[PDB]
Amino acid sequence: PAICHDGKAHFPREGVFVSNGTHWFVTQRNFYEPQIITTDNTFVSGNCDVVIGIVNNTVYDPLQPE
Amino acid sequence: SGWTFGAGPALQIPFPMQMAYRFNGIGVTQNVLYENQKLIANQFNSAIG
Ligand SMILES: *[C@@H]1O[C@H](CO)[C@@H](O[C@@H]2O[C@H](CO)[C@@H](O)[C@H](O)[C@H]2NC(C)=O)[C@H](O)[C@H]1NC(C)=O
Numbered sequence: 659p660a661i662c663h664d665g666k667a668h669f670p671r672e673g674v675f676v677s678n679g680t681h682w683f684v685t686q687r688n689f690y691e692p693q694i695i696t697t698d699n700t701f702v703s704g705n706c707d708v709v710i711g712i713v714n715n716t717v718y719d720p721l722q723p724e
Numbered sequence: 725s726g727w728t729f730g731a732g733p734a735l736q737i738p739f740p741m742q743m744a745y746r747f748n749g750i751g752v753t754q755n756v757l758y759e760n761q762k763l764i765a766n767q768f769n770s771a772i773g
């Protein structure tokens with residue numbers, strides 16, 4: 659239901675998180691297309707304690723490298 | 725599966741996810757349900773009882 663990068667639950671702004679076994683991706687509801695889980699397609703709100711079923715994984719910031 | 729099975733094959737999807745999707749349907753966003761899942765479950769069980 660959410661991804662905890664650093665003590666913060668990342669819910670998907672549109673779509674549901676999926677993983678091809680090892681790597682987690684965001685994809686639409688009625689068509690499968692994997693996209694890397696960045697801060698653009700996910701909105702953070704929470705404390706990574708209340709949500710149940712949250713996996714850790716990681717998110718990619720498109721601004722830090724630049 | 726939620727609504728999907730009313731369109732084509734029954735795309736399996738856990739209930740928490742299905743309810744978060746329903747909430748996002750009415751402008752509430754998934755964070756509300758995933759931060760209040762216990763409360764929603766209690767209210768639903770009480771109402772159904
Ligand atoms: C899940 O998909 C990812 C791709 O996003 C796989 O990671 C590898 O990504 C590189 C990108 O440079 C590809 O060249 C590789 O072909 C990908 N690996 C494979 C096996 O396709 C990741 O390995 C996939 N995981 C599984 C279990 O298939």
Ligand SMILES: *[C@@H]1O[C@H](CO)[C@@H](O[C@@H]2O[C@H](CO)[C@@H](O)[C@H](O)[C@H]2NC(C)=O)[C@H](O)[C@H]1NC(C)=O
Pocket residue numbers: 662665713714
């Ligand atoms: C996901 O990241 C969390 C972040 O806190 C980590 O949880 C750790 O769990 C152990 C076991 O109880 C504690 O001793 C640590 O204090 C926790 N935090 C850290 C930073 O290690 C852990 O890396 C991951 N947990 C799960 C369930 O995936």
